[PDB]
Design a protein around this motif. Structure first.
Motif, PDB file in Angstrom:
ATOM      1  N   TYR A  12       0.353  -1.197  -0.055  1.00  0.00           N
ATOM      2  CA  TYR A  12      -0.074  -0.558   0.303  1.00  0.00           C
ATOM      3  C   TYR A  12       1.156   1.074  -0.513  1.00  0.00           C
ATOM      4  O   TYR A  12       2.499   1.186   0.784  1.00  0.00           O
ATOM      5  N   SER A  41      -2.864  -5.065  -0.345  1.00  0.00           N
ATOM      6  CA  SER A  41      -2.358  -4.610   0.628  1.00  0.00           C
ATOM      7  C   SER A  41      -2.880  -5.363   1.617  1.00  0.00           C
ATOM      8  O   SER A  41      -3.497  -6.492   1.432  1.00  0.00           O
ATOM      9  N   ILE A 139      -8.112  -9.387  13.733  1.00  0.00           N
ATOM     10  CA  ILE A 139      -7.370  -8.353  12.569  1.00  0.00           C
ATOM     11  C   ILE A 139      -6.301  -7.884  12.625  1.00  0.00           C
ATOM     12  O   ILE A 139      -6.275  -7.638  13.654  1.00  0.00           O
ATOM     13  N   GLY A 140      -5.064  -7.662  11.643  1.00  0.00           N
ATOM     14  CA  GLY A 140      -4.142  -7.467  11.680  1.00  0.00           C
ATOM     15  C   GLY A 140      -2.786  -8.191  12.636  1.00  0.00           C
ATOM     16  O   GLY A 140      -2.044  -7.472  13.491  1.00  0.00           O
ATOM     17  N   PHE A 156      -6.676  -6.596  15.994  1.00  0.00           N
ATOM     18  CA  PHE A 156      -7.695  -5.693  16.698  1.00  0.00           C
ATOM     19  C   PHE A 156      -9.432  -7.039  16.949  1.00  0.00           C
ATOM     20  O   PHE A 156      -8.875  -7.379  15.761  1.00  0.00           O
ATOM     21  N   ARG A 161      -7.280  -3.065  20.095  1.00  0.00           N
ATOM     22  CA  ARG A 161      -5.738  -3.565  20.334  1.00  0.00           C
ATOM     23  C   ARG A 161      -5.843  -4.368  21.177  1.00  0.00           C
ATOM     24  O   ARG A 161      -5.807  -3.763  22.218  1.00  0.00           O
ATOM     25  N   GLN A 208       2.910   4.393  16.434  1.00  0.00           N
ATOM     26  CA  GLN A 208       3.229   3.037  15.841  1.00  0.00           C
ATOM     27  C   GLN A 208       5.239   2.457  16.684  1.00  0.00           C
ATOM     28  O   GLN A 208       5.647   3.968  17.193  1.00  0.00           O
ATOM     29  N   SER A 233       4.724   0.253  11.429  1.00  0.00           N
ATOM     30  CA  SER A 233       3.003  -0.773  11.582  1.00  0.00           C
ATOM     31  C   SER A 233       2.960  -1.363  10.009  1.00  0.00           C
ATOM     32  O   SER A 233       3.413  -0.525   9.207  1.00  0.00           O
ATOM     33  N   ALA A 234       2.829  -2.510   9.985  1.00  0.00           N
ATOM     34  CA  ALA A 234       2.060  -3.095   9.282  1.00  0.00           C
ATOM     35  C   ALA A 234       3.050  -3.625   8.357  1.00  0.00           C
ATOM     36  O   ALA A 234       3.076  -3.125   6.823  1.00  0.00           O
ATOM     37  N   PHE A 255       5.582   6.352   4.892  1.00  0.00           N
ATOM     38  CA  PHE A 255       5.574   4.660   4.585  1.00  0.00           C
ATOM     39  C   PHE A 255       6.458   4.250   3.715  1.00  0.00           C
ATOM     40  O   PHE A 255       7.330   5.301   3.262  1.00  0.00           O
ATOM     41  N   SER A 280       3.657   0.367   2.915  1.00  0.00           N
ATOM     42  CA  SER A 280       3.125  -0.731   3.730  1.00  0.00           C
ATOM     43  C   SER A 280       2.688  -1.825   3.655  1.00  0.00           C
ATOM     44  O   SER A 280       2.031  -1.537   2.097  1.00  0.00           O
ATOM     45  N   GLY A 281       1.751  -3.019   4.048  1.00  0.00           N
ATOM     46  CA  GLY A 281       0.971  -3.755   4.229  1.00  0.00           C
ATOM     47  C   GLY A 281       1.216  -5.069   2.496  1.00  0.00           C
ATOM     48  O   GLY A 281       0.465  -5.728   2.706  1.00  0.00           O
TER      49      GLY A 281
HETATM   50  O1  LIG Z   1      -5.363  -1.564  14.321  1.00  0.00           O
HETATM   51  C1  LIG Z   1      -5.974  -0.796  13.524  1.00  0.00           C
HETATM   52  O2  LIG Z   1      -6.587  -0.771  13.448  1.00  0.00           O
HETATM   53  C2  LIG Z   1      -5.393  -2.139  12.454  1.00  0.00           C
HETATM   54  C3  LIG Z   1      -3.867  -1.466  12.309  1.00  0.00           C
HETATM   55  C4  LIG Z   1      -3.098  -0.050  11.806  1.00  0.00           C
HETATM   56  C5  LIG Z   1      -1.756  -0.350  11.987  1.00  0.00           C
HETATM   57  C6  LIG Z   1      -1.024   1.278  12.212  1.00  0.00           C
HETATM   58  C7  LIG Z   1      -2.436   1.630  11.874  1.00  0.00           C
HETATM   59  C8  LIG Z   1      -3.485   2.479  11.664  1.00  0.00           C
HETATM   60  C9  LIG Z   1      -3.884   0.230  11.803  1.00  0.00           C
HETATM   61  O3  LIG Z   1      -4.011   3.819  11.696  1.00  0.00           O
HETATM   62  C10 LIG Z   1      -2.532   4.281  12.223  1.00  0.00           C
HETATM   63  O4  LIG Z   1      -1.653   3.657  11.387  1.00  0.00           O
HETATM   64  C11 LIG Z   1      -3.681  -2.714  10.975  1.00  0.00           C
HETATM   65  C12 LIG Z   1      -2.898  -3.141  10.964  1.00  0.00           C
HETATM   66  C13 LIG Z   1      -2.029  -4.310  10.138  1.00  0.00           C
HETATM   67  C14 LIG Z   1      -2.472  -4.189   8.857  1.00  0.00           C
HETATM   68  C15 LIG Z   1      -2.123  -5.354   7.683  1.00  0.00           C
HETATM   69  C16 LIG Z   1      -1.955  -4.621   6.084  1.00  0.00           C
HETATM   70  C17 LIG Z   1      -2.129  -3.449   5.690  1.00  0.00           C
HETATM   71  O5  LIG Z   1      -2.046  -3.235   4.739  1.00  0.00           O
HETATM   72  C18 LIG Z   1      -2.840  -1.662   4.150  1.00  0.00           C
HETATM   73  C19 LIG Z   1      -1.921  -0.399   5.083  1.00  0.00           C
HETATM   74  O6  LIG Z   1      -1.071  -0.962   4.915  1.00  0.00           O
HETATM   75  N1  LIG Z   1      -3.024   0.669   5.089  1.00  0.00           N
HETATM   76  C20 LIG Z   1      -2.190   1.548   5.365  1.00  0.00           C
HETATM   77  C21 LIG Z   1      -2.843   2.483   5.641  1.00  0.00           C
HETATM   78  C22 LIG Z   1      -2.254   3.989   6.086  1.00  0.00           C
HETATM   79  C23 LIG Z   1      -1.348   3.646   7.673  1.00  0.00           C
HETATM   80  C24 LIG Z   1      -0.973   1.778   7.969  1.00  0.00           C
HETATM   81  C25 LIG Z   1      -1.640   0.758   7.572  1.00  0.00           C
HETATM   82  C26 LIG Z   1      -3.112  -2.280   7.078  1.00  0.00           C
HETATM   83  C27 LIG Z   1      -2.882  -3.346   8.336  1.00  0.00           C
HETATM   84  C28 LIG Z   1      -3.369  -1.953   9.182  1.00  0.00           C
END
Ligand SMILES: O=C(O)C[C@H](c1ccc2c(c1)OCO2)c1ccc2ccc(OCC(=O)NC3CCCCC3)cc2c1
Ligand SMILES: [Cl-]
Ligand SMILES: [Cl-]
Length: 291
Positions: A12, A41, A139-140, A156, A161, A208, A233-234, A255, A280-281
């Motif tokens: 992503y 992603s 999830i995550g 989560f 979380r 993070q 994270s991610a 990122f 990420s992701g």
């Molecule tokens: O705990 C939660 O609600 C969920 C959590 C999360 C983490 C960090 C966060 C966040 C939410 O919001 C503030 O930053 C999470 C956990 C594992 C993941 C695995 C893959 C993934 O793929 C898509 C991707 O990469 N998306 C970007 C969007 C922009 C911010 C960073 C991820 C997304 C994930 C998200």
């Protein structure tokens, strides 16, 4: 042992990505390989029988979000992806582990649904079947396999979380809670190295994280090790030649393109390379280099 690459699939940045790129730790090189058929992603990668599998995820695009039930297989000998049987349900932000040649898909989201369900893929038969669900919706979630036991760590549940973690005992088709981590982590990188399950980074609900802790499966304790240089994270994660590699992720501002490598003998992280762009992701796994 020679000739293995770290593959990174999907990810992503602004939208979901179709990249498949492979890093060679022996020479520092990166190769761009065949794109995924669908940008994704929140997927996981794994390898069985030398084939790389991309499991689940979501296609975020300007035109919407589609959670994925897909399983696709990349053959390095042909540089081609092929579809496999799909999972019972879409699973974004999934965790995956392999036990004895079988792929376990764990948790993940489908819209506002937070799954506790788990299913198992048989490559020989190209079939998925559900197994016992987790005790917690996650999830995550980070997943790793040690000694033919499967661990689901953090995530989560829709409301909170999690610092909790649980283990799946295949011969009993049963999950049991393990000691909780010291830190709440959603979207940590989770892997196995030696006799421990590592949880690196993640999001605790507030920030993070750069901290890293490991669960010793014999003593049932979680212990912090050296922190990563970057909060992330991610992130993608894998193990190769006795070292942990973390790839990308989100630090709250950027990122990341950085790849860090953990040496357990010295208890130190070093920056070893940069991906071709920050993301990420991603899904990550290790297999032979392609043709
Ligand atoms: O705990 C939660 O609600 C969920 C959590 C999360 C983490 C960090 C966060 C966040 C939410 O919001 C503030 O930053 C999470 C956990 C594992 C993941 C695995 C893959 C993934 O793929 C898509 C991707 O990469 N998306 C970007 C969007 C922009 C911010 C960073 C991820 C997304 C994930 C998200
Ligand atoms: Cl997402
Ligand atoms: Cl794997």
């Amino acid at each position: 042992k020679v000739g293995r690459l770290i593959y990174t699939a999907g990810g992503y940045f602004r939208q979901s990505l179709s990249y498949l790129e492979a890093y060679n730790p022996s020479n520092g090189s990166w190769l761009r390989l065949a794109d995924l058929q669908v940008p994704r992603s929140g997927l996981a990668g794994c390898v069985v029988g030398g084939l790389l599998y991309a499991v689940g995820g979501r296609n975020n695009s300007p035109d919407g979000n589609t959670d994925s039930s897909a399983l696709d297989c990349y053959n390095p000998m042909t540089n081609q992806w092929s579809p496999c049987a799909s999972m019972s349900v879409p699973r974004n932000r999934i965790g995956v582990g392999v036990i004895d040649g079988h792929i376990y898909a764990v948790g993940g989201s489908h819209g506002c649904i937070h799954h506790s369900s788990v299913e198992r893929y048989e490559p020989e038969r190209d079939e998925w079947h559900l197994v016992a669900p987790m005790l917690t919706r996650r999830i995550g979630v980070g997943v790793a396999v040690l000694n033919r036991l499967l661990y689901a760590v953090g995530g989560f549940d829709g409301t909170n979380r999690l610092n909790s973690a649980e283990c799946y005992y295949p011969e009993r088709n049963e999950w049991r809670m393990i000691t909780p981590m010291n830190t709440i982590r959603s979207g940590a990188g989770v892997c196995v190295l030696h006799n421990c399950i590592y949880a690196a980074g993640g999001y605790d609900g507030q920030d993070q994280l750069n901290s890293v802790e490991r669960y010793d499966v014999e003593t049932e304790t979680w212990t912090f090790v050296a922190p990563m240089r970057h909060h992330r994270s991610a992130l993608g994660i894998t193990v190769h030649q006795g070292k942990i590699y973390v790839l990308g992720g989100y630090d709250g501002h950027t990122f990341l393109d950085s790849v860090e490598c953990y040496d357990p003998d010295s208890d130190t992280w070093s920056e070893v390379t940069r991906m071709t762009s920050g993301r990420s992701g991603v899904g990550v796994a290790v297999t032979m280099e392609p043709c």
